[PDB]
Each structure stands twice: as structure tokens, then as C-alpha cells.
């Protein structure tokens, strides 16, 4: 029902912090309806030791206690990446961190679980839409996860990659 943040509605660049700048990257990309939106992409499958974070802007709570996070995203399919090493991955983690004000900076909070709280490891389900951008297939999955109770002025989300190839197409944060 009630939206706290929708990346799909951005009237300009996201502006989300990425750490390191070599990992996630803001890129224009498609909706499910082929509307062109801002997305974040990471695909450092040819590099060891990948730990790439992306963090939203401060989202106000506006009275909510339980937060729902709807993610649209596309994973590439390690099988479908020519010459890829065996360490390739097909999931990302989601985290939140609450705060009393917009306290985030380049180095705070630490870029790691604790102070961030892990919501879940996110993977592609077997429900989907797939189209031929021919002949490359665009497959968009949808996953919802929720967390709470949430009590402070607001919060941040984080998305962490550790050696896969994917695009986070949309994040919709809502309550009730």
C-alpha cells in the first residue's frame, strides 16, 4: 500500500553510494514494460575477492513499523557467461540500517554486516517474464522481503554482491 521509496520514480540519477566505485554502477535499463529507468549493475566475474556494496538514500519511516521491500532484478546465469571462472555467483544480500537522521557518509556506516542487519540472501525464483532483445534474453525476477519493527526517524538499504553478474532494476519500499 504506502510507498516510502520507489527507485522507478527518480526524476534524476539515483545518487546511491557505491563501495567500491568499481563494483555497482548506475546504468539506464528496462522495466518489465520496456520503460527506461535508472538501475544498478555489477558484473565483476573476472576478479577475485569481490565485495561490492550499494546503498540507497536515507528513507524516512513516516510512522511505519514493518517495512516491505520489493526488488525487481536480473541475474546472469553463470552458465551463460562465456569463459567465466568457477567462483561465479548468482545471488545478492540485502541489509538495512536505521538512523535518527541522514548520518551516512562515504565511510560510515561500516561496509559490512554489523552495523547493517541482513534481511536475506536474494536469488532468482522460477516465476518470471522473459523476452528476446533478440537474441539476448531479458529475464526480470521479483522478490519481496520484509523487516521490522522499525522505530527511528528513517533507514537505509544495502545491496551486497560477491562475484556475480546482475542488475538491480527496481526497489520499492512500502508499508501496511
Amino acid at each position: 500500500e504506502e510507498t516510502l521509496m520507489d527507485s522507478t520514480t527518480a526524476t534524476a540519477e539515483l545518487g546511491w553510494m557505491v563501495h567500491p566505485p568499481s563494483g555497482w554502477e548506475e546504468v539506464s535499463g528496462y522495466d518489465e514494460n520496456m520503460n527506461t529507468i535508472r538501475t544498478y549493475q555489477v558484473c565483476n566475474v573476472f576478479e577475485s575477492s569481490q565485495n561490492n556494496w550499494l546503498r540507497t538514500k536515507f528513507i524516512r519511516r513516516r510512522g511505519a513499523h514493518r517495512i516491505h521491500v520489493e526488488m525487481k532484478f536480473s541475474v546472469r546465469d553463470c552458465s551463460s557467461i562465456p569463459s567465466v571462472p568457477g567462483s561465479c555467483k548468482e545471488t545478492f544480500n540485502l541489509y538495512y540500517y536505521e538512523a535518527d537522521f541522514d548520518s551516512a557518509t562515504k565511510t560510515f556506516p561500516n561496509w559490512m554486516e554489523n552495523p547493517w542487519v541482513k534481511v536475506d540472501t536474494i536469488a532468482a525464483d522460477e516465476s518470471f517474464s522473459q523476452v528476446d532483445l533478440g537474441g539476448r534474453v531479458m529475464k526480470i525476477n521479483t522478490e519481496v522481503r520484509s523487516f521490522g519493527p522499525v522505530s527511528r526517524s528513517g533507514f537505509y538499504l544495502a545491496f551486497q554482491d560477491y562475484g556475480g553478474c546482475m542488475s538491480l532494476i527496481a526497489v520499492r519500499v512500502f508499508y501496511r
Binding site: 549493475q41 558484473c43 566475474v45 573476472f46 546472469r76 546465469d77 539476448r136 531479458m138 553478474c165 546482475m166
Partner: peptide, 9 residues
């Protein structure tokens, strides 16, 4: 399969 997502180098 999402073959439009280019690796980095």
C-alpha cells in the same frame, strides 16, 4: 539468462 549484462574487465 540476461546475456545483455556485460562483464567488467
Amino acid at each position: 539468462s540476461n546475456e545483455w549484462i556485460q562483464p567488467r574487465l
